[PDB]
Amino acid sequence: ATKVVCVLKGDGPVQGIINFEQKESNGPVKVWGSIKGLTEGLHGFHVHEFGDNTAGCTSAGPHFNPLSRKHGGPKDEERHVGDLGNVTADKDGVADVSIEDSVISLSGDHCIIGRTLVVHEKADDLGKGGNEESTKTGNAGSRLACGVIGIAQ
Amino acid sequence: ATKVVCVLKGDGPVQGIINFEQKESNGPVKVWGSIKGLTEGLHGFHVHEFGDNTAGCTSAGPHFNPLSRKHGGPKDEERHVGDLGNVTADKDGVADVSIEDSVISLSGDHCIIGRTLVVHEKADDLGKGGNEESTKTGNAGSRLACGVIGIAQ
Ligand SMILES: *[Se]c1ccccc1C(=O)NCc1ccc(OC)nc1
Numbered sequence: 547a548t549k550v551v552c553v554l555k556g557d558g559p560v561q562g563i564i565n566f567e568q569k570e571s572n573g574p575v576k577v578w579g580s581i582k583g584l585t586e587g588l589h590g591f592h593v594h595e596f597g598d599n600t601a602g603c604t605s606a607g608p609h610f611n612p613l614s615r616k617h618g619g620p621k622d623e624e625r626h627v628g629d630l631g632n633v634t635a636d637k638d639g640v641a642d643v644s645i646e647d648s649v650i651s652l653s654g655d656h657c658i659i660g661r662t663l664v665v666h667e668k669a670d671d672l673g674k675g676g677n678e679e680s681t682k683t684g685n686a687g688s689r690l691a692c693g694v695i696g697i698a699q
Numbered sequence: 700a701t702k703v704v705c706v707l708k709g710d711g712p713v714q715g716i717i718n719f720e721q722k723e724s725n726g727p728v729k730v731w732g733s734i735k736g737l738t739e740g741l742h743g744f745h746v747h748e749f750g751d752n753t754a755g756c757t758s759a760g761p762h763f764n765p766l767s768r769k770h771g772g773p774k775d776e777e778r779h780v781g782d783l784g785n786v787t788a789d790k791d792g793v794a795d796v797s798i799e800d801s802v803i804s805l806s807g808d809h810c811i812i813g814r815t816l817v818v819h820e821k822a823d824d825l826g827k828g829g830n831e832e833s834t835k836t837g838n839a840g841s842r843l844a845c846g847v848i849g850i851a852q
Pocket residue numbers: 547548549652653654655657658659697698
């Protein structure tokens with residue numbers, strides 16, 4: 547019933563299209579699409595707090611964390627709202643994204659519209675990296691590509 | 700105070716940053732910033748319905764029109780919510796934007812977050828051009844640059 551979309555681009559050759567769909571406000575969000583230009587393996591994938599791309603992906607700020615929790619993976623109770631885990635690129639450098647999440651929303655209070663979706667340099671350790679940063683950023687490194695999450699038809 | 704921002708980009712030289720700020724719920728929104736790479740003169744300036752930039756500015760769809768009105772200028776009663784009139788570029792090709800509008804909002808059903816801001820090829824005739832298209836698009840022609848309207852810090 548609600549559809550939103552995000553075009554990912556950045557400083558390098560990473561580019562992607564990510565769709566979000568939510569049947570009812572009380573419902574899970576299905577996330578699908580594709581990103582190309584990636585190194586093979588896991589890349590952290592997060593909604594960041596601001597939909598501000600003024601100075602590139604840096605202006606998006608920290609992970610979207612309306613409930614003031616620590617960083618985790620999407621299956622954890624202890625996570626930021628924006629913690630969508632990792633996407634995986636194949637040897638061709640393509641990640642086919644297929645996620646269902648019940649914490650992000652396209653309505654309500656945990657709404658991600660107007661925020662920024664970011665795909666990161668490195669794997670998100672999902673809060674299990676063994677250092678302080680693990681519970682803040684997941685050590686996923688720099689921001690390869692991003693875009694503002696917008697209302698679709 | 701709610702703050703939102705939009706980075707305008709497109710296929711050619713047109714690029715801009717536009718800020719929006721709203722001090723009170725249902726109060727006027729101040730719009731300010733700058734766009735460069737334009738031809739001297741008026742360029743239509745609108746909030747379009749979808750924050751969908753998957754295929755560039757075309758995917759943004761028609762003017763944002765939650766109240767099913769006809770096209771007009773920002774100072775008309777009969778206008779779309781997204782009708783912000785024209786920005787004016789000087790001989791250097793620079794438009795310095797300074798608008799206050801009391802129809803758009805940064806909350807509620809008039810909210811423009813997650814929609815697309817578009818700067819157009821030609822002047823918006825503000826619905827006074829004396830053809831049919833005047834009361835739909837204002838005859839402002841192609842979409843030179845656009846961006847999704849995102850939440851700012
Ligand atoms: Se996103 C959000 C947060 C808090 C309250 C309400 C909303 C909301 O979803 N309303 C705005 C909206 C979003 C998407 C669409 O597209 C069909 N229309 C309106």
